Design an enzyme around this catalytic site. Structure first.
Site, PDB file in Angstrom:
ATOM      1  N   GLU A 133       0.707  -0.976  -0.219  1.00  8.25           N
ATOM      2  CA  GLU A 133       0.276  -0.288  -0.228  1.00  8.25           C
ATOM      3  C   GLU A 133       0.861   1.387  -0.178  1.00  8.25           C
ATOM      4  O   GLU A 133       0.650   1.899   0.273  1.00  8.25           O
ATOM      5  CB  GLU A 133      -0.819  -0.243   0.896  1.00  8.25           C
ATOM      6  N   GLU A 240      -5.763 -11.088  -0.847  1.00  9.83           N
ATOM      7  CA  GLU A 240      -5.795 -11.210  -0.156  1.00  9.83           C
ATOM      8  C   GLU A 240      -7.914 -11.458  -0.095  1.00  9.83           C
ATOM      9  O   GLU A 240      -8.433 -10.851   0.470  1.00  9.83           O
ATOM     10  CB  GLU A 240      -6.005  -9.813   1.296  1.00  9.83           C
TER      11      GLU A 240
HETATM   12  O1  HAH Z   1      -6.110   0.535   4.613  1.00  7.48           O
HETATM   13  C1  HAH Z   1      -6.862  -0.851   4.153  1.00  7.48           C
HETATM   14  C2  HAH Z   1      -8.180  -0.047   4.111  1.00  7.48           C
HETATM   15  C3  HAH Z   1      -8.929  -0.512   3.258  1.00  7.48           C
HETATM   16  C4  HAH Z   1      -8.673  -1.983   3.227  1.00  7.48           C
HETATM   17  C5  HAH Z   1      -8.008  -2.859   3.152  1.00  7.48           C
HETATM   18  C6  HAH Z   1      -6.784  -1.704   3.665  1.00  7.48           C
HETATM   19  C7  HAH Z   1      -5.779  -2.610   4.024  1.00  7.48           C
HETATM   20  N1  HAH Z   1      -5.285  -4.143   3.711  1.00  7.48           N
HETATM   21  C8  HAH Z   1      -5.126  -5.109   4.439  1.00  7.48           C
HETATM   22  C9  HAH Z   1      -5.722  -5.754   5.714  1.00  7.48           C
HETATM   23  C10 HAH Z   1      -5.564  -6.612   6.710  1.00  7.48           C
HETATM   24  C11 HAH Z   1      -4.277  -6.764   7.081  1.00  7.48           C
HETATM   25  O2  HAH Z   1      -4.102  -7.655   7.861  1.00  7.48           O
HETATM   26  C12 HAH Z   1      -3.192  -6.693   5.223  1.00  7.48           C
HETATM   27  O3  HAH Z   1      -2.182  -6.303   5.966  1.00  7.48           O
HETATM   28  C13 HAH Z   1      -3.443  -5.335   4.535  1.00  7.48           C
HETATM   29  O4  HAH Z   1      -2.938  -5.386   3.530  1.00  7.48           O
END
Ligand code: HAH
Length: 331
Positions: A133, A240
């Site tokens: 990200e 994910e």
């Molecule tokens: O900051 C966000 C905002 C919206 C959706 C997903 C994210 C972050 N997206 C994920 C969420 C779960 C964590 O366990 C992962 O490490 C992460 O990459």
């Protein structure tokens, strides 16, 4: 088990089917996992703070248990995020007087971190998410404003991808992110990975998080992402994946289970998705779900604290859902 097929078995000639795990479940649901998946990712137990809490102290016990779980059972492991704004202890960014660390301190600390982490599982982890990200989520902003960007330097992704590639020059290094199908952000990710590739940085694939819900992105919106990223001649991994029954910024707070409409849309929507992944099995080599069953999921506490969600093809009792059958592969 009782009469149901293996999910990952039905995709053996298409792509891996993985899940985000935790050492707490390796005992209880270890077998369910070892039967539907041939790949796994540590949801958190392999991030910066989780293995490097203090500057000179490392804690790999939990991570090790996972890798030992997989390699014994012929399962693949994706290492999750080395460089991320979240879950990174304060010291990494601070100096002696409590001030901010310099670019040099930053380079040394990051370097030693990568070597220790990527090197420990060298030749065992087939794919890593070096940077997670990095792109902004605000239309007129490219780079997400973070301490990595500030204290180290705008060339922080390059360094990351370079350091990683030395620790294990056999691992496939991906750039992981979410909202990857949003037309605006899709191009921001595309240009970054494009800039990276030209600069000579060793990026080998793009990581499409897949945090989608039962409404969007459209089938066409996903298809476009796939083709956009796949054209850069890199591998694509849905990392994910999950299907939220709510929309983000959902005010609805009283569900004890999903509405009949929610289940219908989801079963239908999952079927379309994997049907699109199969059409593109050339470009996609791995699809991971951020979790094993509805019994657990980070969605239960984000973005709404205490709001239960059911984003998988396996119910809260590790039993297959109607979406499961409409997703089994052709093999
Ligand atoms: O900051 C966000 C905002 C919206 C959706 C997903 C994210 C972050 N997206 C994920 C969420 C779960 C964590 O366990 C992962 O490490 C992460 O990459």
């Amino acid at each position: 088990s009782t009469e149901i097929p293996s999910l990952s078995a039905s995709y053996a000639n298409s792509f891996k089917i993985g899940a985000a795990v935790h050492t707490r479940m390796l005992q209880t649901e270890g077998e369910f996992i070892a039967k539907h998946y041939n790949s796994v990712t540590a949801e958190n137990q392999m991030k910066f703070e989780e293995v490097h809490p203090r500057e000179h102290e490392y804690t790999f016990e939990a991570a090790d248990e996972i890798v030992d779980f997989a390699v014994a059972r012929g399962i693949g492991v994706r290492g999750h995020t080395l460089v991320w704004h979240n879950q990174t202890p304060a010291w990494m960014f601070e100096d002696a007087s409590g001030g901010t660390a310099s670019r040099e301190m930053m380079l040394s600390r990051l370097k030693q971190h990568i070597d220790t982490v990527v090197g420990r599982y060298k030749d065992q982890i087939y794919a890593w998410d070096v940077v997670n990200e990095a792109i902004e989520d605000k239309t007129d902003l490219i780079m997400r404003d973070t301490k990595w960007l500030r204290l180290l330097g705008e060339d922080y992704l390059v360094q990351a991808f370079n350091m990683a590639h030395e620790a294990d020059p056999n691992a496939l290094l991906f750039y992981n992110d979410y909202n990857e199908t949003d037309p605006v952000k899709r191009e921001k990710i595309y240009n970054l990975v494009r800039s990276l590739l030209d600069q000579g940085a060793p990026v080998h694939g793009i990581g499409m998080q897949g945090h989608w819900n039962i409404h969007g992105p459209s089938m066409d919106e996903i298809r476009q992402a796939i083709e956009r990223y796949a054209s850069l001649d890199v591998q694509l991994h849905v990392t994910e994946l999950d299907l939220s029954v709510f929309r983000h910024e959902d005010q609805r707070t009283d569900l004890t289970e999903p509405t009949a409409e929610m289940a219908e849309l989801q079963q239908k929507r999952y079927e379309d998705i994997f049907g699109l992944f199969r059409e593109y099995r050339s470009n996609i080599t791995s699809v991971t779900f951020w979790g094993v069953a509805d019994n657990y999921t980070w969605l239960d506490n984000f973005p709404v604290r205490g709001r239960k969600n059911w984003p998988f093809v396996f119910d809260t009792e590790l039993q297959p859902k109607d979406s499961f059958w409409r997703i089994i592969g052709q093999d």
